[PDB]
């Protein structure tokens, strides 16, 4: 008569890489080897705005230029692992007899997995940091909708304009919130209503971004450059799959590595002597002294505005997408990392 150890199973941790998530559609990933040195970053836009001549005696507005400055923000990420000193001790000594060898291999396996956990925790940290940064600059919908409309700000922000905008805000708050809740009573207009709501969400966000012309993530099907990313929980993703029915493509095409930034060259001298390092010192020297006369052209600027984003080869990212209006938009669920780490979504 005996008792039987009839099964031994161990869970396996799947690697989660930032580039494989659909969320990475909404970012530009630069590999900058020594980030700790950069004290502060800076981006300066210069925009020229024209006016239209008028026959009235009206006083005219002169030539208009605006100078916009944006700055980097840094993030620190850290995790703690614990190792039993006995394991780190027996790892050095050679094995004497096969039981010592069995204990040695068990020890090195344990410590290796203890480090696997660490690298995995840091990757989940990267992805959570990007998601939180995106959440910090995402104003709510009922404020965005009437502000995207240029019809209500045509004459600028006086008193009465704002007194009416607050009314539109409170009204959209009372009416259009929890739309996927209202779909049940809305009934047969369910699909068209959800489509119009998602399309209002899409059109509300401004699309004027400097890197718009660069060849970012594309549809797996030829053409149709992907426009953006939805992030939803699993239940709402199921409801969206039901109402939208068929999905568009089921996979997309994205880059395989991050664009490297190297401080080599005379940027090294400008970093030794001075605090500043100039980006794209090749083109920036060429524009001033090498080719001072010629005026810039967008086609001549496009190879410059992508430092290393362009050269990379593309591979199929697995992510669910749809097509709405004229835009291919991926819909992505992350509520599998936050469940497994057992942190709130």
């Amino acid at each position: 008569k005996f008792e039987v150890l009839l099964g031994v199973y161990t869970n396996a941790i799947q690697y989660v890489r930032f580039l494989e998530t659909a969320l990475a559609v909404s970012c530009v990933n630069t590999e900058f080897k020594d980030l700790s040195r950069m004290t502060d970053g800076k981006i300066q836009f210069r925009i020229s705005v024209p006016t239209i001549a008028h026959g009235d005696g009206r006083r005219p507005s002169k030539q208009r230029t605006f100078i916009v400055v944006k700055n980097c923000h840094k993030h620190h990420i850290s995790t703690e692992m614990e190792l039993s000193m006995l394991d780190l001790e027996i790892l050095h000594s050679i094995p004497e007899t096969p039981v010592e060898y069995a204990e040695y291999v068990g020890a090195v396996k344990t410590v290796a997995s203890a480090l696997q956990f660490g690298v995995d925790a840091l990757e989940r940290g990267l992805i959570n940091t990007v998601l939180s940064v995106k959440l910090r600059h995402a104003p709510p919908m009922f404020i965005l909708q009437t502000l995207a409309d240029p019809t209500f700000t045509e004459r600028g922000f006086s008193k009465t304009v704002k007194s009416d905008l607050i009314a539109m805000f409170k009204r959209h708050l009372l009416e259009h919130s929890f739309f996927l809740d209202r779909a049940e009573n809305m009934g047969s207009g369910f699909s068209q209503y959800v489509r119009s709501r998602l399309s209002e969400m899409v059109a509300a966000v401004s699309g004027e971004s400097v890197l718009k012309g660069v060849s970012t993530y594309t549809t797996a099907k030829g053409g149709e450059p992907v426009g953006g990313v939805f992030i939803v929980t699993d239940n709402v993703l199921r409801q969206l799959l039901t109402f939208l029915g068929e999905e568009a493509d089921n996979q997309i095409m994205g880059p395989s590595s991050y664009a490297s930034f190297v401080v080599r060259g005379e940027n090294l001298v400008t970093a030794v002597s001075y605090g500043r390092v100039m980006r794209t010192f090749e083109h920036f020297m060429a524009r001033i002294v090498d080719s001072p006369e010629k005026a810039g052209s967008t086609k001549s600027d496009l190879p410059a505005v992508a430092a290393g984003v362009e050269d990379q080869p593309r591979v199929p990212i697995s992510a669910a997408v749809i097509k709405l209006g004229n835009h291919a938009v991926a819909v992505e669920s992350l509520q599998k990392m936050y469940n497994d780490t057992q942190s709130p979504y």
Binding site: L91, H92, V111, Q116
Partner: peptide, 18 residues
Amino acid sequence: EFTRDVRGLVEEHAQASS
């Protein structure tokens, strides 16, 4: 993900007689 570098950082270097 695992090297002689990480091992050399890790090894605790015990004291025992053979």
